[PDB]
């Protein structure tokens, strides 16, 4: 079933370089993938820990069959899976700089507006593509965005990704909701759409420009729900262009139909990158 969207990789082609983390289903590793005719490719390897439940196997490999459906430079690329032997692996591209929120915290105030808008343009490009493909991410946050050595940002973590149902275009939950990133109608009614992903994306915009501030700081989950419901919105980060902050507000429209489409976001961001007013340096 995962084989319809993922290539089976001969185990001998993977060598594990280092263990770099632990996910829900076991270790995450940096490794090398050797394909015929080329240099070893650096890869991220998710391993299914020994003694897993069979439900855990389905759900682990579940993400891989979601990933394998996408082919886009701002979505983490699947190299394939190992299923014919133990341990069971999912092999993705390697992102040198890890999570976006962490990366920006180490580099507080280090980027230009163009550099940061550039990151946000990449993220919205991948989301646009996801939207088009009939998926809702549901878990869009800076901490679920990965960034490479060229500062290219990619959507990652498709544990909560679901396929949109054919209606007047939503998924309804069955509840591991990240509240401060979530659109109000998704919180209240548990109705998830590309437009709730745009709300989350507004949050990501604010995190990126803030260099990895927690949205709403020490506010409790109840504090946030009530605040947003009342009309409160996060204030403008330091050194944020007015038009960027206004795009954030646009994403945070209470009525989802009023948020811009991802394609609209990408176009607005391209316009900023192409506007010399936003370039601190002209030589
Ligand atoms: Cl301005």
Domain positions in the chain = 1-94, 95-283
Is residue 93 part of an annotated ligand binding site?
A: no
Distance in Å, CA 224 to ligand 1 centroid: 28
Length of the chain equals: 283
Distance in Å, CA 241 to ligand 1 centroid: 4
Give the other-Cβ count within 10 Å of 230's Cβ: 7
Give the chain's end-to-end CA distance (angstroms, integer).
54
User: Resolution of this entry in Å?
Assistant: 2.4
Report helix, strand or coil for 89. Answer: strand
Give the CATH H-level superfamily of domain 1-94: Phosphorylase Kinase; domain 1 (3.30.200.20)
Here the tokens at position 70 are 């996408």
Measured CA distances, 86 to 11, 49, 50, 55, 90 (Å):
9, 9, 8, 17, 12
CATH of domain 95-283: 1.10.510.10
Here the tokens at position 50 are 């020994």
**Enzyme catalytic residues:** 139
| Cα Rg of the chain, angstroms | 19
Quote the CA–CA distance of 118 and 244 in Å, as a whole number: 12
In contact, 170 and 193? CB cutoff 8 Å? yes
Q: Which residues share a beta bridge with 46?
A: 28, 90
Here the tokens at position 130 are 């996801």
Quote the CA–CA distance of 43 and 192 in Å, as a whole number: 32
Element (DSSP H or E) covering residue 194: helix 194-210
Quote the CA–CA distance of 46 and 30 in Å, as a whole number: 9
Question: In terms of C-beta density within 10 A (0-12 exposed, 13-18 middle, 19 or more buried), how is residue 53 classed?
Answer: exposed
**Residue for token pair 């979505």:** 75
Experimental method of this PDB entry = X-ray
Q: What is the DSSP string of 217-257?
A: TT--HHHHHHHHHHT--PPPPTT--HHHHHHHHHHT-SSGG
Quote the CA–CA distance of 247 and 240 in Å, as a whole number: 11
Quote the CA–CA distance of 127 and 121 in Å, as a whole number: 10
Does residue 87 have a cis peptide bond before it, meaning omega lies within 30 degrees of 0?
A: yes
Of 100, 184, 197, 203, nearest to 158 (Cα)?
197
List strands edge to edge, sheet with 89-93: 14-23, 26-33, 41-47, 89-93, 78-82
Is residue 118 part of an annotated ligand binding site?
A: no
Is residue 28 part of an annotated ligand binding site?
A: yes
């Amino acid at each position: 079933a995962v084989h319809e969207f993922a290539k089976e990789i001969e185990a001998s082609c993977i060598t594990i370089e280092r263990v770099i983390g632990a996910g829900e289903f076991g270790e995450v590793c940096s490794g090398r993938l050797k394909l015929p005719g080329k240099r070893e490719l650096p890869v991220a390897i998710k391993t299914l820990k020994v003694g897993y439940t069979e439900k855990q196997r389905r759900d682990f490999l579940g993400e891989a069959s979601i990933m394998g459906q996408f082919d886009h430079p701002n979505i983490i690329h699947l190299e394939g899976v190992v299923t014919k032997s133990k341990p069971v692996m999912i092999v993705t591209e390697y992102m040198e700089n890890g999570s976006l929120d962490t990366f920006l915290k180490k580099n507080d105030g280090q980027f230009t507006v163009i550099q940061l808008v550039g990151m946000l343009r990449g993220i919205s490009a991948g989301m646009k593509y996801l939207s088009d493909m009939g998926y809702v991410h549901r878990d869009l946050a800076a901490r679920n965005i990965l960034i490479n050595s060229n500062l290219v940002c990619k959507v990652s973590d498709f544990g909560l990704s679901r396929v949109l149902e054919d209606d007047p275009a939503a998924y309804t939950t069955r509840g591991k909701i990240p509240i401060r990133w979530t659109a109000p109608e998704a919180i209240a009614f548990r109705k998830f759409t590309s437009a709730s992903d745009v709300w989350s994306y507004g949050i990501v915009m604010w995190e990126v420009v803030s260099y990895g501030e927690r949205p709403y700081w020490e506010m409790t989950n109840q504090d946030v729900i009530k605040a947003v419901e009342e009309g409160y919105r996060l204030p403008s980060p330091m050194d944020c262009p007015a038009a960027l902050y206004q795009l954030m507000l646009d994403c945070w429209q209470k009525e989802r139909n009023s948020r811009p489409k991802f394609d609209e976001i990408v176009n607005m961001l391209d316009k900023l990158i192409r506007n010399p007013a936003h370039h601190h340096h002209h030589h």
